[PDB]
Amino acid sequence: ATQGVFTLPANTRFGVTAFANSAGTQTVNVLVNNETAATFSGQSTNNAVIGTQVLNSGSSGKVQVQVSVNGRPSDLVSAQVILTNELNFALVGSEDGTDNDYNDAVVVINWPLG
Amino acid sequence: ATQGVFTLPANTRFGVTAFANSAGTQTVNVLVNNETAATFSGQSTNNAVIGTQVLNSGSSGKVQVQVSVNGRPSDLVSAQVILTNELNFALVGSEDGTDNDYNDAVVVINWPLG
Amino acid sequence: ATQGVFTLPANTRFGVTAFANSAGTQTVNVLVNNETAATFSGQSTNNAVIGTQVLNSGSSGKVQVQVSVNGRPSDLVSAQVILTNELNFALVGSEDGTDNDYNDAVVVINWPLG
Amino acid sequence: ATQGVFTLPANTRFGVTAFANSAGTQTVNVLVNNETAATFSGQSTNNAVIGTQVLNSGSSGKVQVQVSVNGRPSDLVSAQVILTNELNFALVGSEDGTDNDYNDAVVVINWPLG
Ligand SMILES: CO[C@@H]1O[C@@H](C)[C@@H](O)[C@@H](O)[C@@H]1O
Ligand SMILES: CO[C@@H]1O[C@@H](C)[C@@H](O)[C@@H](O)[C@@H]1O
Ligand SMILES: CO[C@@H]1O[C@@H](C)[C@@H](O)[C@@H](O)[C@@H]1O
Ligand SMILES: CO[C@@H]1O[C@@H](C)[C@@H](O)[C@@H](O)[C@@H]1O
Ligand SMILES: [Ca+2]
Ligand SMILES: [Ca+2]
Ligand SMILES: [Ca+2]
Ligand SMILES: [Ca+2]
Ligand SMILES: [Ca+2]
Ligand SMILES: [Ca+2]
Ligand SMILES: [Ca+2]
Ligand SMILES: [Ca+2]
């Protein structure tokens, strides 16, 4: 199944934050309506916050997360969870190797802000 | 029901990261077996990261998040999500006021780490 | 925070299914747009499906689950999860007693159907 | 990533319930310790319950859900959610065709039971 793609409410500010847990250098791209809106990169095995940014879901609400390591696309897992019918989290994990921890880059999207 | 309380695997490293979205200064306390292990503070209405840290769940595995604003504990919502039977998120929102966005302080706990 | 209230897409069919795991008879009421749309009752300590039904979310999309034992409201917990940006589950647990399993009645709402 | 595999606590009862939303006949297999523990087959486009059973998780606690239609394995999506640090849901969707609803068979696993 497709993973790392989320439909947000249109024209809504959201946070996106990436964490690294791998020997490999992670590169995370965040697309909004297929336009590159953010790119984060770094290397840590201790959960470094390689990037955090406020974006806007725009007219389409379509947000996609992609992760690669020195050009190789990582396999993704994802889900969205809503608390008290209001508070939204869109979650991504990614695997760059063979141990299947899916934590090599972790991406958390949250809304609403403010 | 109790919120913001999570049983992690014993003696396991985890990340904890807090974001703020309130006019008020948020204080986030992370407790491991009922003892404060990290404290973050800050004020933002733009989802700023007010802290991030790596902790160990210790011999009991018991982790709790508490949030307070202007000397007053905030109400919490929370849940845990597991993706591909491996990647764990413990998610918390908090409400300090009247509007019920539960985003005043947003706290993300993730494990395993690298 | 409010629990057991979900916003579904308008004019969409959904399933609602209730399970019982308590010494006490559970009553589950499902409201759509503030009108009772389904009701199930039963006692089981073995996860009986005390009712399952297909409903339409109508113009509002507002769906509320209430659980009671002989007229006494149970405390609820709830969340919504979305898989592959398409498959939705709204989840409710309830506690009628002192042991805090929140499984006394468990309610699952799923959409889309068909 | 692997989907439909969940680690439950050892020697613990859980409920499994399958719903169908497809023109095709769905076959849902539940494997406990890599051996078939339940099988459900049926057809509905109205979310009918094609099986519901209580099972034990056994020594390893490893539970796997597989879905097929006309003998051809369906693609799966899944996740696990925990409410109030106690109430567990393991959730599976499956796609037998081209429309990507992942509702063709929907499987809900819940624990603890009464
Ligand atoms: C070489 O493998 C990569 O780096 C290791 C230190 C681990 O984080 C592993 O999950 C990751 O895939
Ligand atoms: C005074 O109210 C607090 O600050 C505002 C700017 C909002 O973020 C609100 O949710 C928060 O409770
Ligand atoms: C009297 O307690 C009720 O019935 C028991 C058999 C348990 O299922 C318990 O969770 C429930 O609250
Ligand atoms: C022919 O396609 C199958 O049956 C239809 C009635 C739909 O439920 C569709 O999702 C399913 O994959
Ligand atoms: Ca890895
Ligand atoms: Ca890793
Ligand atoms: Ca608020
Ligand atoms: Ca706020
Ligand atoms: Ca109980
Ligand atoms: Ca019970
Ligand atoms: Ca389908
Ligand atoms: Ca279908």
Please report the sign of the dihedral spanned by the C-alpha atoms of residue B89, residue B14, residue D112, residue D40.
positive
CA C48 to chain centre: 14
Please state, in angstroms and rounded to a whole number, the distance separating the CA atoms of residues D12 and C73.
29
First-last CA distance in chain C:
33
Chains touching chain A through at least 3 C-beta pairs below 8 angstroms are B, C, D
Structure solved via: X-ray
**What is the A102 CA–ligand 10 centroid distance (Å)?**
34
The reply to whether ligand 3 has any atom less than 6 angstroms from the CB of C97 is yes
Beta-strand relationship, C13-32 and C62-69: antiparallel
Closest CA to A44 of A22, A15, A18, A64: A22
User: Residue D114: which of C44, C92, B33 has the closest Cα?
Assistant: C44
Torsion of CA A101, A103, A105, A108, to 10 degrees: 140
Quick one: tokens of D57? 């998780």
Residues of B in contact with D3 (CB under 8 A): 84
Task: Ligand 4, residue D21: give the atom nearest the CA.
Answer: 8
Amino acid at D62: K
Compute how many other C-beta atoms are within 10 angstroms of the C-beta atom of residue C34: 8
Q: What is the 3-state secondary structure (H, E, C) of chain C?
A: CCCCEEECCCCCEEEEEEEEEEEEEEEEEEEECCEEEEEEEEEEEEEEEEEEEEEECCCCCEEEEEEEECCEECEEEEEEEEECCCEEEEEEEEECCCCCCCECEEEEEEECCC
- Pick from C84, B91, B103, C9: which is nearest to A6 by CA? C84
Which resolution, in Å, applies to this structure? 1.3
CA atoms within 13 A on the CB side of B103: 26
For residue A94, count CB atoms less than 10 angstroms from its CB and return exposed for 0-12, middle for 13-18, buried for 19 or more: buried
Q: Say which residues have a Cβ less than 8 Å from residue B99's Cβ, sequence separation at least 6.
A: none
Comparing CA positions, the residue from C85, C111, C81, C107 lying closest to residue C21 is C107
Peptide bond into A112 cis (omega under 30): yes
Ligand 2 neighbours by CB, cut-off 6 Å: A 114; B 21-24, 45, 96-97, 99, 101, 104
A63: Cβ contacts below 8 Å, ≥ 6 apart: A5, A6, A7, A8, A14, A16, A30, A31, A32, A55, A57, A90, A109
Give the three-state DSSP class for B84.
coil
Question: How many residues does this entry show for chain D?
Answer: 114
Element (H, E) at D107: strand D105-111
Residue whose structure tokens are 């940014």 = A53
| CB atoms closer than 10 angstroms to residue C95 | 22
Q: Number of helices (H) and strands (E) in chain D: give both, helices first.
A: 0, 8
Q: Give B93 to chain D, closest Cα distance, Å.
A: 14
Domains in chain B with CATH codes? 1-114 (2.60.120.400)
Q: According to the annotation, is C114 in a ligand binding site?
A: yes
